[PDB]
Amino acid sequence: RKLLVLLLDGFRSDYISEDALASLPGFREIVNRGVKVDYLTPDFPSLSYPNYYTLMTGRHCEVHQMIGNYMWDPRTNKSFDIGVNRDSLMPLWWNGSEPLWITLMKARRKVYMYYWPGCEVEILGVRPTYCLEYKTVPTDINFANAVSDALDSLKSGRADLAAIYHERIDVEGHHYGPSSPQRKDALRAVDTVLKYMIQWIQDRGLQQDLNVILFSDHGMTDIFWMDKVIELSNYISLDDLQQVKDRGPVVSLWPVPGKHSEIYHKLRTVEHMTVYEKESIPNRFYYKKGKFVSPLTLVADEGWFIAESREMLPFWMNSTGKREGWQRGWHGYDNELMDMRGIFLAIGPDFKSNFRAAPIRSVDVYNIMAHVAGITPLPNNGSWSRVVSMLK
Numbered sequence: 001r002k003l004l005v006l007l008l009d010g011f012r013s014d015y016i017s018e019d020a021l022a023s024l025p026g027f028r029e030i031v032n033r034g035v036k037v038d039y040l041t042p043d044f045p046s047l048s049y050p051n052y053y054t055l056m057t058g059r060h061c062e063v064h065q066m067i068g069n070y071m072w073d074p075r076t077n078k079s080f081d082i083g084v085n086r087d088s089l090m091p092l093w094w095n096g097s098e099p100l101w102i103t104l105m106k107a108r109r110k111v112y113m114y115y116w117p118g119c120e121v122e123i124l125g126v127r128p129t130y131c132l133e134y135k136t137v138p139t140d141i142n143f144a145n146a147v148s149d150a151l152d153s154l155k156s157g158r159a160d161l162a163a164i165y166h167e168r169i170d171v172e173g174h175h176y177g178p179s180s181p182q183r184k185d186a187l188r189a190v191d192t193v194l195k196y197m198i199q200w201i202q203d204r205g206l207q208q209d210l211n212v213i214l215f216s217d218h219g220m221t222d223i224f225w226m227d228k229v230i231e232l233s234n235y236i237s238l239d240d241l242q243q244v245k246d247r248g249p250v251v252s253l254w255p256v257p258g259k260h261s262e263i264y265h266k267l268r269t270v271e272h273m274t275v276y277e278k279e280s281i282p283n284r285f286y287y288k289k290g291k292f293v294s295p296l297t298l299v300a301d302e303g304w305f306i307a308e309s310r311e312m313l314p315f316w317m318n319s320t321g322k323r324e325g326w327q328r329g330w331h332g333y334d335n336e337l338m339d340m341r342g343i344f345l346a347i348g349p350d351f352k353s354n355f356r357a358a359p360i361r362s363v364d365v366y367n368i369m370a371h372v373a374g375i376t377p378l379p380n381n382g383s384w385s386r387v388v389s390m391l392k
């Protein structure tokens with residue numbers, strides 16, 4: 001039985017509340033004829049690359065090792081800078097756990113991936129059958145064409161799993177905030193493509209041969225520049241830092257030798273964030289055992305934003321002159337915050353219909369995908385008992 005997987009980045013749980021579903025006929029049909037969980041709780045940190053790998057390994061970030069969008073290895077002095085620099089392709093960052101598409105390839109099944117971050121990497125010596133590499137933010141038309149092409153590759157047997165990544169709901173949530181009309185517009189365009197998807201599956205006679213699983217990596221919450229910005233240089237000298245990675249809710253610090261205690265005690269006094277020495281990170285994050293986790297980790301309170309200085313803030317290109325746009329939504333915070341929740345839906349012969357499932361965790365999704373794909377899951381942290389009742 002074929003499997004199509006849609007990762008809708010930054011799709012917050014309440015984007016398809018009852019109220020919202022009244023005007024979302026694509027999602028409403030999927031809910032009415034398939035499975036919808038209350039919400040999907042992401043891993044900490046509720047950032048993209050960590051949670052992509054959680055979703056596709058069933059393992060917490062401290063196990064699959066992809067603990068940040070930005071990571072640094074003191075041993076080799078290499079960085080993973082949100083998949084952009086060349087050294088992001090190093091297997092060093094990806095070989096901490098085998099993701100589902102690699103396991104499928106190794107069992108000699110076929111995998112087509114469309115814009116999926118990571119499909120462009122040789123992971124544990126293996127690559128998917130097809131990777132349409134992520135380069136820029138895919139358009140709504142890119143998304144619709146990728147769905148139609150995925151259906152054709154699954155129907156013809158060129159693919160047994162097809163996986164599609166869509167970013168634009170995340171983009172508009174960032175640029176205009178989670179409750180803005182621009183985010184809603186990007187969601188409506190997805191809803192429409194999902195209506196065509198339902199129609200195309202009927203056109204092509206796939207209804208009995210195909211499950212579709214949709215999920216998101218995290219939600220989105222309001223941020224408040226410039227009031228709720230923490231500037232590290234107000235408290236410490238950056239020259240006392242060997243390395244800093246990322247800006248926003250979760251920032252990794254590497255003090256210079258001899259300055260660890262000094263930097264820690266200076267930043268512990270700062271309100272609206274929490275400074276964790278690595279051995280003191282909260283256990284419920286399932287994060288502190290990751291080898292790339294930094295000696296100090298800064299976690300901002302919801303809505304706050306941490307950077308070296310205000311001028312290092314990630315302004316975006318709203319005017320094509322310089323990057324002067326302010327960000328109005330963000331994510332990455334404490335994964336048990338309501339606004340960080342994502343979604344999980346499923347439809348097809350293997351799933352119950354009109355079934356309101358209890359909320360699940362990001363680690364739970366891997367067992368579902370492996371089950372309907374007919375591959376034995378590698379050991380993981382998902383709970384079968386949390387998901388088993390949605391299956392037909």
Ligand SMILES: *[C@@H]1O[C@H](CO[C@H]2O[C@@H](C)[C@@H](O)[C@@H](O)[C@@H]2O)[C@@H](O[C@@H]2O[C@H](CO)[C@@H](O)[C@H](O)[C@H]2NC(C)=O)[C@H](O)[C@H]1NC(C)=O
Pocket residue numbers: 175318319324325326327328
């Ligand atoms: C491009 O962005 C600038 C930056 O300012 C704004 O960024 C937006 C993304 C939005 O979140 C807004 O709230 C934020 O202040 C815009 O300049 C702003 O223009 C508005 C007029 O619409 C003024 O009221 C603001 O004072 C001004 N802000 C600054 C810092 O100058 C700009 O309008 C926007 N669009 C372009 C340039 O086409």
Ligand SMILES: *[C@@H]1O[C@H](CO)[C@@H](O[C@@H]2O[C@H](CO)[C@@H](O)[C@H](O)[C@H]2NC(C)=O)[C@H](O)[C@H]1NC(C)=O
Pocket residue numbers: 059060063286379380381
């Ligand atoms: C998450 O799941 C993994 C399953 O692989 C657990 O890690 C394994 O634990 C066993 C012992 O229970 C070891 O023999 C393996 O070497 C571990 N594998 C890896 C890759 O680390 C891990 O303990 C689980 N974590 C939690 C918090 O339950």
Ligand SMILES: *[C@@H]1O[C@H](CO)[C@@H](O)[C@H](O)[C@H]1NC(C)=O
Pocket residue numbers: 077
């Ligand atoms: C790491 O590389 C940078 C250049 O990218 C260099 O300036 C720095 O000294 C290096 N650090 C170590 C510890 O080798």
Ligand SMILES: *[C@@H]1O[C@H](CO)[C@@H](O)[C@H](O)[C@H]1NC(C)=O
Pocket residue numbers: 091092095123124125
């Ligand atoms: C995974 O990557 C690491 C880092 O280069 C490497 O040491 C290891 O041999 C790789 N494993 C496989 C199975 O390719």
Ligand SMILES: [Zn+2]
Pocket residue numbers: 009010047048049170217218
């Ligand atoms: Zn994301």
Ligand SMILES: [Zn+2]
Pocket residue numbers: 010048170171174331
């Ligand atoms: Zn995002």
